[model samples]
Target: PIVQNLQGQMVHQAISPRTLNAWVKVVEEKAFSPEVIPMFSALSEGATPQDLNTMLNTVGGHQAAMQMLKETINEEAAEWDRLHPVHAGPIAPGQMREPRGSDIAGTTSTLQEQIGWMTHNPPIPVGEIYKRWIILGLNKIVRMY
Candidate 1:
């Protein structure tokens, strides 16, 4: 994606489903809003051209969407050590870290529990790079944004 920096010049970014999903989770948890949840859901599920159109509109506009995308990724980049491993390592580069053992019934930690986990063991971060069809299929909407 071609994104504008805070300093106001446009720059290029290489993106992927993993990248989008990772950004969504960061924004989702940071703003304390669900505004980006649907984007995350759609991206993960292989958004259609129509779906991208809707998401682009639903998210306000290219201006707003790109603002959040670039802002959060950069804002959170420093926490990569603290946050990146919550989603990567012991696996592939774009893969989200998985919960281990009996904790795999799809239940997730609550906000309160997340704090405790972060204080201690740290919970796995949400999201991952989706299947190829799903990832590549997302360009229509992403481009529109």
Candidate 2:
């Protein structure tokens, strides 16, 4: 929906279905408040004005929602870190296997160099992933590919 943000410019804020799903799953835990379930459910399926009113009627609703959102995002970041485990200290670089037999010299060298770069660098950080989710449109959050 188009609404004026802090900048006073009309900005459309959309929540990703995947983000909502992950959020709901995390909020489902007994540790969090259960009051947001209906609010979020309506949000998931597209909330009506009545739903918005009902959601607003709950005291500190946004607070609870944000708390759950924070946890969900944190858990996602942790999961990303888990998958991309990094060894600490000593930036010891390594060599790529030499290509042979019909491999184009220049092209193969560039490809191997890129492969080595990818091996050394964590291509995208979880912060960047969330940053995209926040700034870019909904579909960009999770790649269709």
Candidate 3:
């Protein structure tokens, strides 16, 4: 679905499903407005017309595939929020635990609980985490005063 972009050249026409999902948000946000259709269409390889026939015609069927991707991401994010609510633990700098190999006796370990935090979600930046840490500290200090 290598369609020429507004630039009148080739773009290789690829997008991570995450970016595709984000773009769909904009497209759908605008109710699939007239302007953004081409934005998505330009990403497809030279295939169907710009207006497109079906949802697959544009996005190279990414919208459908992203559906499969989308389902898990919502659940994954919720799990993240649950594990990392605002009242979670503090940052332990210089902390590097065993990459794994904790304990898993009997009952046959399943992927749901087995996958460690290191996978999937990248670590939040130390500076960013600490910035909030300072804010939390300041709030507590001000209240004590």
Candidate 4:
């Protein structure tokens, strides 16, 4: 498998089953939506080539990349609650409750958790590299928009 970046750069070449499984897990956990499981199920069930192509091309494919995303979201959610215990409370009519410095720190810490994992684990095999690169690239793009 050849993974391309948003700028059309060939970021990686080759992909392995293990890496594919990891990416699938990420998508499943982070991008959980009504159509996700059904779409993957269809692909795995030998859907027509055209159908598979369509499914893979859609944002639905990010379903498999959701695991990591969900983990990140959960971490941020926890940190947000911890730092802003009163965030749920109603504010004055003209007042706004913005995240404090500590809250920003917490969010940054959650992102660091992911960077640590990627740096330590590093994708294995050429195939795994490609798969992981694609997943990470998708993650970056999602974050940007």
Candidate 5:
């Protein structure tokens, strides 16, 4: 989301859902991309927000060509998740004590299986899913989603 500042001399920008998703994918991919590297570097160098904004603009304004960039990122993240689902959390009580290494591996394996099933047998649409769950007062999760 981009908006002109109060003085109209500058534009304030926010990460669109697409860009947010892209950044997420970048972290998942290059693991050591400038995005992650500069964060720690900046902390060591005591960089300010303006400094960070300058760095971002130097690469490319976060808003420039954002829609296309974001779409690309979103697609990548979806593909990556489908191929290698990250462990989310425990499925049931005592199924896992904590999200440790083996637990995470187990969760990821389960997620892949679930996604495979979903691909073969798709779930209901978001609206219908909400309607069915809301009867049980689970709209909080829906709203959060």
Candidate 6:
């Protein structure tokens, strides 16, 4: 998905499903107006494409659809701590970039959080990637003025 905004950066590709679900949660939360809720809900379980047609047209016409996009991004990026982790760089040049560690997951964080980052071309900055993905994911899907 290609996007243009105040920052003038265009994401070259679609965001991941994790990013997709994450962004949908974002829209479902901050976005208001009766249409906003049901528009997203059209994507809810058992909804058909037909159910979303009007929802899409309605959302496509909303000002809030693009509401304070820059602000939303800044809000998340602000609390984010980049450079907080080592091995936060791209996979080593020569290797195909696989994650294989015996590390344990416990009270610190959820265990299903582990993943493969090979999707990004060369690589992506690690520390603030999720924040960026959330922002980018939202940007990628939302239509704007």
Cα error, candidate 4, residue 114 (Å): 25
Error of 2 at 107 (Å): 40
For model 3, give the 10-residue run with minimal summed lDDT. 98-107
Q: In model 5, which range of ten residues has the least summed lDDT?
A: 124-133
Q: Write the per-residue lDDT of candidate 4 for residues 78-119, one digit (tens) a residue.
A: 555576575654376743344332223233323232222223
Q: Pick the candidate with the highest lDDT.
A: 4
Pairs that collide, model 2: none
C-alpha positional error of residue 84 in candidate 6 after TM-score superposition, expressed in Å? 4.9
lDDT for 37 (candidate 3): 40
Error of 2 at 15 (Å): 21
Candidate 3 Cα deviation (angstroms), residue 92 = 16
Candidate 5 residue-wise lDDT at 141: 20
Q: Name the lDDT value of residue 12 in candidate 2.
A: 34
Which segments of model 3 are wrong by more than 4 Å? Answer: 1-60, 87-145
* Candidate 2 per-residue lDDT over residues 1-145, each given as its tens digit: 1234697553433444554555445444521344334334434332222222232233224454444444544455455456645445335555333222111111123433323322334431222233322222222212311
User: Which residue segments of model 5 deviate by more than 4 Å?
Assistant: 1-64, 89-145
Q: For each candidate in the order shown, give its overall lDDT on alpha carbons.
A: 0.36, 0.34, 0.33, 0.38, 0.32, 0.34
Q: Evaluate residue 52 in candidate 3 and report its C-alpha lDDT on the 0 to 100 scale.
A: 20
lDDT of 5 at 43: 27
13-83 in candidate 5: lDDT tens per residue? 43244444554445345333334443323221322222222333333433433334334434443554566
TM-score of each: 0.24, 0.27, 0.22, 0.26, 0.22, 0.26
Task: State the TM-score for model 3.
Answer: 0.22
Give the Cα error of residue 73 in candidate 4, in Å: 1.2
**Once model 5 is optimally superposed onto the true structure by TM-score, how far is the C-alpha of residue 31 displaced, in angstroms?**
24
How does residue 123 of candidate 5 score in lDDT? 27
CA displacement after TM-score superposition, residue 105 of candidate 5 (Å): 21
Winner by TM-score: 2
**Residue ranges of candidate 6 with Cα displaced over 4 Å:** 1-31, 34-38, 41-65, 81-88, 94-145
**Candidate closer to the true structure by TM-score (higher is better), 2 or 3:** 2
